[PDB]
Amino acid sequence: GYDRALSIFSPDGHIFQVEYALEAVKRGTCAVGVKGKNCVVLGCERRSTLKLQDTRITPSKVSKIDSHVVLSFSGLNADSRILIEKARVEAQSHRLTLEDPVTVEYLTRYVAGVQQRYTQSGGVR
Amino acid sequence: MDIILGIRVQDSVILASSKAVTRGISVLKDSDDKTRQLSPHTLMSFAGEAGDTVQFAEYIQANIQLYSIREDYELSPQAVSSFVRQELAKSIRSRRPYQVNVLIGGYDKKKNKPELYQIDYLGTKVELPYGAHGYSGFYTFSLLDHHYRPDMTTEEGLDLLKLCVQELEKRMPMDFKGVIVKIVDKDGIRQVDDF
Amino acid sequence: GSRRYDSRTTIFSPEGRLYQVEYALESISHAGTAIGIMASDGIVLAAERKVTSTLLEQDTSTEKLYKLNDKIAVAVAGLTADAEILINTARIHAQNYLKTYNEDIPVEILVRRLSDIKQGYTQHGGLRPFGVSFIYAGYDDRYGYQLYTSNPSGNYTGWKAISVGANTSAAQTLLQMDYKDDMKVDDAIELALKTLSKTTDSSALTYDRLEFATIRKGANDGEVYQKIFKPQEIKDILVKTGIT
Amino acid sequence: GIQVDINRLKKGEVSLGASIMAVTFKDGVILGADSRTTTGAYIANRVTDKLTRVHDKIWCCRSGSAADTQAIADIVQYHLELYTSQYGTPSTETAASVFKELCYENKDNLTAGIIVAGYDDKNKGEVYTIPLGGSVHKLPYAIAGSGSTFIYGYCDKNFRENMSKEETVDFIKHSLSQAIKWDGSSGGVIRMVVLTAAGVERLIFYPDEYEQL
Amino acid sequence: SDPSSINGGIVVAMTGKDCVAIACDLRLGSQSLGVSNKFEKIFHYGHVFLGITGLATDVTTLNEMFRYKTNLYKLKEERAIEPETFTQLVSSSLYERRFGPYFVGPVVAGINSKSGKPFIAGFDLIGCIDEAKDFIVSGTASDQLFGMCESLYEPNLEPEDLFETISQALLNAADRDALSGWGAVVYIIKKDEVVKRYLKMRQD
Amino acid sequence: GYDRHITIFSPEGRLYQVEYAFKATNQTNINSLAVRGKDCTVVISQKKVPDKLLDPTTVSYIFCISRTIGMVVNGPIPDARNAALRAKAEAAEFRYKYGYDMPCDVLAKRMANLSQIYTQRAYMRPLGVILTFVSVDEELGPSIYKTDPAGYYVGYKATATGPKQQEITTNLENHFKKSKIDHINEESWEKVVEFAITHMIDALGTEFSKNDLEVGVATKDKFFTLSAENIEERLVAIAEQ
Amino acid sequence: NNYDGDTVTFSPTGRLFQVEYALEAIKQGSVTVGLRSNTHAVLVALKRNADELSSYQKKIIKCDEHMGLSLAGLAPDARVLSNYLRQQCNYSSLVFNRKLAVERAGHLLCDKAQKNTQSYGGRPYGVGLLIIGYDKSGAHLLEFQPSGNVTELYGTAIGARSQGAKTYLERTLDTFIKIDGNPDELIKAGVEAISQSLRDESLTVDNLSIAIVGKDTPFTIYDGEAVAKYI
Amino acid sequence: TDRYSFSLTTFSPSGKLGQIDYALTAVKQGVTSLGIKATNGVVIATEKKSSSPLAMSETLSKVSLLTPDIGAVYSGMGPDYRVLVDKSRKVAHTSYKRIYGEYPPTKLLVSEVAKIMQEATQSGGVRPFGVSLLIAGHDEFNGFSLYQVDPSGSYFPWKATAIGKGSVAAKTFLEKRWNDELELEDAIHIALLTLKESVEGEFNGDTIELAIIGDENPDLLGYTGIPTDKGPRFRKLTSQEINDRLEAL
Amino acid sequence: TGYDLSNSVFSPDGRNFQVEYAVKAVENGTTSIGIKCNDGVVFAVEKLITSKLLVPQKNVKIQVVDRHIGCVYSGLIPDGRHLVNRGREEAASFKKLYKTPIPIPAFADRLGQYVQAHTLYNSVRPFGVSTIFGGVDKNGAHLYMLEPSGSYWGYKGAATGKGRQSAKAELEKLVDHHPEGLSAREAVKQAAKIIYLAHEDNKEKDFELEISWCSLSETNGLHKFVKGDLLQEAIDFAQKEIN
Ligand SMILES: [Cl-]
Ligand SMILES: [Cl-]
Numbered sequence A: 001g002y003d004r005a006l007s008i009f010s011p012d013g014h015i016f017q018v019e020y021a022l023e024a025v026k027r028g029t030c031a032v033g034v035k036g037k038n039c040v041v042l043g044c045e046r047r048s049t050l051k052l053q054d055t056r057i058t059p060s061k062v063s064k065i066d067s068h069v070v071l072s073f074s075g076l077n078a079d080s081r082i083l084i085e086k087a088r089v090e091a092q093s094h095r096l097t098l099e100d101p102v103t104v105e106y107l108t109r110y111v112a113g114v115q116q117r118y119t120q121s122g123g124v125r
Numbered sequence B: 001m002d003i004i005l006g007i008r009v010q011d012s013v014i015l016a017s018s019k020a021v022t023r024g025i026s027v028l029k030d031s032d033d034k035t036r037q038l039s040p041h042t043l044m045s046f047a048g049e050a051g052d053t054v055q056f057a058e059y060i061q062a063n064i065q066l067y068s069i070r071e072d073y074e075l076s077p078q079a080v081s082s083f084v085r086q087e088l089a090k091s092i093r094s095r096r097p098y099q100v101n102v103l104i105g106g107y108d109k110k111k112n113k114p115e116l117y118q119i120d121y122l123g124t125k126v127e128l129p130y131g132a133h134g135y136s137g138f139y140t141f142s143l144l145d146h147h148y149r150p151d152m153t154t155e156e157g158l159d160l161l162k163l164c165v166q167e168l169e170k171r172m173p174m175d176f177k178g179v180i181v182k183i184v185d186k187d188g189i190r191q192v193d194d195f
Numbered sequence C: 001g002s003r004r005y006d007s008r009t010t011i012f013s014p015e016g017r018l019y020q021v022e023y024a025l026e027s028i029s030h031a032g033t034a035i036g037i038m039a040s041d042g043i044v045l046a047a048e049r050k051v052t053s054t055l056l057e058q059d060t061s062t063e064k065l066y067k068l069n070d071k072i073a074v075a076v077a078g079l080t081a082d083a084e085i086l087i088n089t090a091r092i093h094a095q096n097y098l099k100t101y102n103e104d105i106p107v108e109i110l111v112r113r114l115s116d117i118k119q120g121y122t123q124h125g126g127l128r129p130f131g132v133s134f135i136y137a138g139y140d141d142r143y144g145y146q147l148y149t150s151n152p153s154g155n156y157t158g159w160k161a162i163s164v165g166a167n168t169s170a171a172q173t174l175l176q177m178d179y180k181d182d183m184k185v186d187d188a189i190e191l192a193l194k195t196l197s198k199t200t201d202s203s204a205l206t207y208d209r210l211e212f213a214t215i216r217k218g219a220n221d222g223e224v225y226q227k228i229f230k231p232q233e234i235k236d237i238l239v240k241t242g243i244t
Numbered sequence D: 001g002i003q004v005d006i007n008r009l010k011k012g013e014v015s016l017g018a019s020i021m022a023v024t025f026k027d028g029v030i031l032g033a034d035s036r037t038t039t040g041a042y043i044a045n046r047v048t049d050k051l052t053r054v055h056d057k058i059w060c061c062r063s064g065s066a067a068d069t070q071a072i073a074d075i076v077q078y079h080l081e082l083y084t085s086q087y088g089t090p091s092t093e094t095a096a097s098v099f100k101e102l103c104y105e106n107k108d109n110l111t112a113g114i115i116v117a118g119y120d121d122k123n124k125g126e127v128y129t130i131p132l133g134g135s136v137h138k139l140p141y142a143i144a145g146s147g148s149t150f151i152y153g154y155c156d157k158n159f160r161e162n163m164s165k166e167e168t169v170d171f172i173k174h175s176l177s178q179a180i181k182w183d184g185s186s187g188g189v190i191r192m193v194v195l196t197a198a199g200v201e202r203l204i205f206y207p208d209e210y211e212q213l
Numbered sequence E: 001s002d003p004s005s006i007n008g009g010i011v012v013a014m015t016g017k018d019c020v021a022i023a024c025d026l027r028l029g030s031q032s033l034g035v036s037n038k039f040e041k042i043f044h045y046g047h048v049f050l051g052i053t054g055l056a057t058d059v060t061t062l063n064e065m066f067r068y069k070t071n072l073y074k075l076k077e078e079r080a081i082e083p084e085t086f087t088q089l090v091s092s093s094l095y096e097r098r099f100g101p102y103f104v105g106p107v108v109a110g111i112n113s114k115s116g117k118p119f120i121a122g123f124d125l126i127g128c129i130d131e132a133k134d135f136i137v138s139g140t141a142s143d144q145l146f147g148m149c150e151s152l153y154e155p156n157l158e159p160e161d162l163f164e165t166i167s168q169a170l171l172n173a174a175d176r177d178a179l180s181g182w183g184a185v186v187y188i189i190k191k192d193e194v195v196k197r198y199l200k201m202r203q204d
Numbered sequence F: 001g002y003d004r005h006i007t008i009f010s011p012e013g014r015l016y017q018v019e020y021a022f023k024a025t026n027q028t029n030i031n032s033l034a035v036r037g038k039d040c041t042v043v044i045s046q047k048k049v050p051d052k053l054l055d056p057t058t059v060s061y062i063f064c065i066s067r068t069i070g071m072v073v074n075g076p077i078p079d080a081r082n083a084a085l086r087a088k089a090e091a092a093e094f095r096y097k098y099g100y101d102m103p104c105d106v107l108a109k110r111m112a113n114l115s116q117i118y119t120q121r122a123y124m125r126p127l128g129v130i131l132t133f134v135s136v137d138e139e140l141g142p143s144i145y146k147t148d149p150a151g152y153y154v155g156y157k158a159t160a161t162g163p164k165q166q167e168i169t170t171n172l173e174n175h176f177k178k179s180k181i182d183h184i185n186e187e188s189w190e191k192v193v194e195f196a197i198t199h200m201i202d203a204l205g206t207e208f209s210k211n212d213l214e215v216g217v218a219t220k221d222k223f224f225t226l227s228a229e230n231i232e233e234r235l236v237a238i239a240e241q
Numbered sequence G: 001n002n003y004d005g006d007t008v009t010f011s012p013t014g015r016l017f018q019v020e021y022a023l024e025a026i027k028q029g030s031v032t033v034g035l036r037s038n039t040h041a042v043l044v045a046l047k048r049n050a051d052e053l054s055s056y057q058k059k060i061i062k063c064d065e066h067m068g069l070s071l072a073g074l075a076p077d078a079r080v081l082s083n084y085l086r087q088q089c090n091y092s093s094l095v096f097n098r099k100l101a102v103e104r105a106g107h108l109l110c111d112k113a114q115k116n117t118q119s120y121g122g123r124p125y126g127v128g129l130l131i132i133g134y135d136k137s138g139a140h141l142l143e144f145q146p147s148g149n150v151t152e153l154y155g156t157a158i159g160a161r162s163q164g165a166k167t168y169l170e171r172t173l174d175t176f177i178k179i180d181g182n183p184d185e186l187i188k189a190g191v192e193a194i195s196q197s198l199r200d201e202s203l204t205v206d207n208l209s210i211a212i213v214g215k216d217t218p219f220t221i222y223d224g225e226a227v228a229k230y231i
Numbered sequence H: 001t002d003r004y005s006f007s008l009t010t011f012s013p014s015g016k017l018g019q020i021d022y023a024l025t026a027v028k029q030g031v032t033s034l035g036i037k038a039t040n041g042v043v044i045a046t047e048k049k050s051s052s053p054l055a056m057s058e059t060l061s062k063v064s065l066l067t068p069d070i071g072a073v074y075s076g077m078g079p080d081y082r083v084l085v086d087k088s089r090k091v092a093h094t095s096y097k098r099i100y101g102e103y104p105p106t107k108l109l110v111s112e113v114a115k116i117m118q119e120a121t122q123s124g125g126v127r128p129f130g131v132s133l134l135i136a137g138h139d140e141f142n143g144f145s146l147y148q149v150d151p152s153g154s155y156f157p158w159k160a161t162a163i164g165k166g167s168v169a170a171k172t173f174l175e176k177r178w179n180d181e182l183e184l185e186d187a188i189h190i191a192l193l194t195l196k197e198s199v200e201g202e203f204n205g206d207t208i209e210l211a212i213i214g215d216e217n218p219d220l221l222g223y224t225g226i227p228t229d230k231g232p233r234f235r236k237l238t239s240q241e242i243n244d245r246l247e248a249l
Numbered sequence I: 001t002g003y004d005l006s007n008s009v010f011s012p013d014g015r016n017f018q019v020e021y022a023v024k025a026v027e028n029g030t031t032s033i034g035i036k037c038n039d040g041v042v043f044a045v046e047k048l049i050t051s052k053l054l055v056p057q058k059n060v061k062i063q064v065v066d067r068h069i070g071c072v073y074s075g076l077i078p079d080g081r082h083l084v085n086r087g088r089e090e091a092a093s094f095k096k097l098y099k100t101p102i103p104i105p106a107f108a109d110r111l112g113q114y115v116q117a118h119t120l121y122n123s124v125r126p127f128g129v130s131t132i133f134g135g136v137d138k139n140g141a142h143l144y145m146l147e148p149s150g151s152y153w154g155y156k157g158a159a160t161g162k163g164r165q166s167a168k169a170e171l172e173k174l175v176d177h178h179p180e181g182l183s184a185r186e187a188v189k190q191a192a193k194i195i196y197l198a199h200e201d202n203k204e205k206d207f208e209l210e211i212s213w214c215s216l217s218e219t220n221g222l223h224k225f226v227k228g229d230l231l232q233e234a235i236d237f238a239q240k241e242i243n
């Protein structure tokens, strides 16, 4: 298996691969989240250099993880699908063992844990 | 043993399932619901080896719910039944097979038709107007051959079902503590509380 | 050890870009142009063969257009060898779905899985990405006629009309100009060919330098037919639209 | 009895119940065997060759399962050919060790009663016997197979060390003659193989001769 | 406990003059209990027909498997699979599961589109091919079918006459078997047309 | 320029590591020669023992691969022995699996395919050796097949290998132009060895003692190497004519 | 320079720089002293602290009832190697009912350290060890270096300014070797030896660390008020 | 252990795959080989560049049988070709004949070979194959066909083509001579003419290697009895058979 | 260039510079020798006394393989130990399968192939030792010397280390003056002398002598160390010759 340590420290104490990943997020379309008294609203930007699009079938920017939780993102589109899939699986697994749907904090903690694991695992970015 | 029945009528599918859970010479529970909702318009009843039944039902339930979230779309009863059959078909040649028999009652929203599938633990699928697993069939099939009509209403189907339960209560050796009845139609799944 | 010779294919640049994905897209931009146009009653796939030789066997050839199943087809842009690896995977995935659910695979599901495979080669494994861009053209009973595109990054998007490969900038402008929503298949056929005829690097567009296909509901009553055009059928449709 | 030797075989497999023996003498060593192979009471092959070459001047007598002994002998021949390419001619002891290793390590799955016999120039004639368990036993002479039970008495009384070639051939002929006469699993022709400094000589003896001894 | 006779069922195939026929019963049971009278055992992939008797779950599984394999075949080969080739594919696939086999008795039937020659073939559960000019039989009433076919069959029958012979063979065999019957289907296959007929038989 | 360190293509379509493996061949500074007779195949090689402390009997570049096959190597002894051990194993396995002795040309192909793998796979380096296989094959008769680090192999009427290979090659070429045949028309192997030594003396221009040469002979059903006294006897016969 | 990237590379003069850089980590480590007579063997170690608010880094580790070592360099690497020694001592007891010889202990450490200097990916151990013990052939003192080299000695010292203590022991060789049947006098000689490596700092109660093993003495470590006797 | 688990072939900033381009440069250096398709057959041919006159050129076969109805020839690196032929023969059995009980059609075997060459372009710790193949073959439903396969794994069907040293000139020569009404004997004649241009030294049956895919050969089958089995369509022309056609040239 | 940075890489000469660099490590090490005699072999080695604190006689460098083979080496001592550990596994599996103890030529190739294997990949380093070894088998006495490249030959006499040229010169004289052969007891005495003469190339630190031997008559074909009276007798002989 490909083992190379791609994410590593530099003399000044930075992990450049993690910081360059943040630049990819800075390139991505804008996403905003605002929570009110009895609701939360997720807003998302869609760049208008793409005409002749089919909005029926084009992947939506906001994704349902379970019937009560949603996930939006900014950055690489292909990467986001992998996190969403893992999160959806974990959401069903939680209902199966705990007999109760995930909390928003738990689902976040899981997704954040996956992201972290890719910062100190060999062979991955 | 356990009693699970199914009757497809004009506009709905009706599933009846026994409430008794027996271990040894003791009826441990008399209010057990031997079914899981796989999707808003698909219901699966089950019966067989202890432990295996619920473990299998919930495993399927989780997989169908995962599909629904991923595609934001409900799988047809035919598609769900085929998925369930394949899982049982894999299972039978495993180290330890699931000894579970199921009935899948669903309402296909695209076709606007009710559908009833009977699948045994070997992975043997059949679509039927009426179905049953275990020793129940030895009484209910011949009874339904006589009394069943294809164009019946949901109310006529419930009276036809009452006729089955009465016969089973009369001639079955074991006390199965009545049945929980559920109806699947265009408006989804609901339970008949007084039976 | 071996560290010395590792290119590190799956890393970020300081600007937050994937080197190998960007360079794979640069490769694809030199490939023969492929166009997809979606109409209300069907889909058109048109593609330009890469500088044809007169002694090339044209009728028994397949370079650009491939069949994934009875309802779905793809137009290729990039390395053909790479595309065939992905095509056979896609063909198998479609048959796995049919075996499991006794229903033809929904177009998006097939596209997503094929795009997820490409994504994997950019995040792990230390291998180079697939130098291929697809245009997916297919039909299902949920969304009807659909056009998608995927590229080496593993990102996919849906389209009404789209081009991949060479001169996409010029091609997309022309499509954006003449396309409209209430369009028919026969009109879309004419748009596809006219667009290629103007964006082509060749002197004149001829039958022997093209691949063409349609996905209509033109079969008898509520069923979809895939037509991969023969050489003579392309020759006829080229005269009928007044290009030659 | 002999049954638990034959009770070992897999159902329906060819049986190599046998009258095999190897005898050292002044000039070297002689291997001897019958030619009968059975499937129950049917003789599958009446002209079998149970004396088999694993090296130029290292041979073995096979008994038990035909399949198992053949598979083993083929592997041993392979090992000794590879040994010769690297280290030169192997000793008879070395050959017996390779046989033992296969028989012992696979003692549960195998039924192979093998006698190993060879000629060195330093060590002269040597005989090693390897029974079912996978143990090794170096002896002046050895007998084995279903028919050997009937000639323990005869062979012990008649064997002498430093016999001549003609005497040893007579000793083997008379012995196997009796083993064949009494054992139903043994019969056919009496094959022999002579191992000396002179080379390798094959001998055969037919019923009409040995029966009326 | 005997996989091949839990569900029950029968398939038979015959050749005629420039045609083939394949027929099956409709019963699916659980030992003594009859469960379904709509369970067809004949499938087709292009112009090649496959009938399968034995354990019902494996009948279903193998149909889905050969649909899978013939679809990929068509995409790669750019043509429909022929009966002779398909027969080999069935044999390979069954023997792949030599020491954990599908409990089935499949039967291939069809006409080669190139040569026009009528073709039939049968298999055991581990994939031993049984080729035949005249007829192939399979299922819980195989003995009965062998008896009916051997006596009723004659070579070079016309499609209309062949229909009567195969139908009478299946019906009278099924009525002497407890686990077979409950309806029947007969396929008559010509070079470029295929007729499917449902037979009236006793429902006990 | 890391394309010169591992086995990948250079801009001009070359594999430099393979080319440098060829130069390692002549590191020992030994010349070899192989010829075919009617019933036999003879291979000869120079033997150079510079150090006085060496046991000359252990200094050898000829190997007995199987009973029938012999192999002479041009190149460093560690790689030579590496190749010899593998060839011995492959020949033994072939006999066990397929029930007959591995032919000389089949073994050559097998070792050549192994050599090819080292030219394509990066982690394995090529062996810096040229393997010359000789036998009297039961189907094809007297045979000479030679393998190099590139994975190339071919049969030979006769051949030579080493630093002064070209001089030996043309010497043999001129003989076969004259004789008009593919082999040495000679009954006994003894005189085929005498031919081989004589033509090496003419080509190289040096005289040989019994300890300056190493000889291998292949006949039907056995390959063997000659002792110092066997060669001395052979050198006497050349001098007396 | 160009030949110090990894352990798998030789320099043009035949040196392994990654092994030499591991050796350098030992020189930076705090001083520790080892010495033995015929009856007993003694380890003396100067412990080091981060600051006045911190504890003093423990230098001595027990391996068995009859064996143990002191460390100098990377402490986690000493923990790995000492753990390996504990298992090997223990394997010898469970399988052979036999106390592991101090010489074999050294051989096992050598071979473990060596494998890390010939393979790609791994690294050499960054610690030096002084192993003492009493077995069937009397008292023993070993010196382990992460190059693989293990050496049996009467006395030695490793760490920063270890040359001072090593010179003292070289002078005192004839005296301390004959301190038989007297633990306290052998320790005194070790405490005086380590004192030749001190600069500005002196031996205090929570600074000094002593260990001993012998004929009728199991391997025991002395810290805190228990070493106040020897100041 | 093999620590090279990463790609040795990668995209350069310009979008080139360097190792594939360099492999094609190796093919350019290689000796000329060609293929021509007729109405009733296919011909493939090449020059036998001998390394030494002492070497027996008969033992080195540049034209190889893959199946009874499919043959192959190359230009580029000979050792790479040899192992591809070994792998190509085996894959014809494992992934087809052992499944369908019959030999694969030309296009599919070609597809399997291309897959092997594509993997050497992407897999870890390997370089691409330094060869271009020409594969001629026949099968019942597709008839006669001729394919080229490149180091990238790309393959194209041809009416006629040439690869290697003098391919540019050879392809021009074939464009003038090729028509859709060519008989097999005419295609062999044109092949020899085309090849004479690229060959410099001796030009005879001993220096030229040439094989055909034509009619079935019952005599080359080795047995009789089964009517359906009619023999291999692949036949390698002998040294004598070539020289006969060089007289009436 | 850069051809010397990685192992298993050919230079344009056709050389593996990493192996040549390992030879430099061997040349840096202490002197060790081997002497073949009438019916056996003798091994000897130079042990540099770094300090008074080194326990005499208790840092043994010569190693035994099986019961009949002796091994000594110069260079990186741990690399030599690793090689001997492999040798013992090779000798163990040979005796396990073939019953007879491993022959010396057979044993020599087992080491040779193992050392050669470490010149095939860049993921491993070549061995930093030249190993002199041998013993007595069925075919008589054998002496071998194995180098970092994997190259080995049979020897009448062998030497390696910092004083190899001095030892080689002294060995060449013994071969010339004793064509019929040298006895086992004589070879022990000569071995001592040659180490003392070879110590002139390493004369800063004084040294400790260590000798071992295998002989069909003297040691019954088994490997033994030279100790006590026989060792002191050999030292006295060497002391008398330098003066
Ligand atoms: Cl036998
Ligand atoms: Cl091979």
Ligand SMILES: [Mg+2]
Binding pocket: D180, D181, D182, D183, D184, D185, D186, D187
């Ligand atoms: Mg008898």
Ligand SMILES: [Mg+2]
Binding pocket: E174, E175, E176, E177, E178, E179, E180, E181, E182, E204
């Ligand atoms: Mg019936």
Ligand SMILES: [Mg+2]
Binding pocket: E203, E204
């Ligand atoms: Mg009935």
Ligand SMILES: [Mg+2]
Binding pocket: F006, F007, F017, F118, F119, F120, F121, F122, F123, F124, F125, F126
């Ligand atoms: Mg390489």
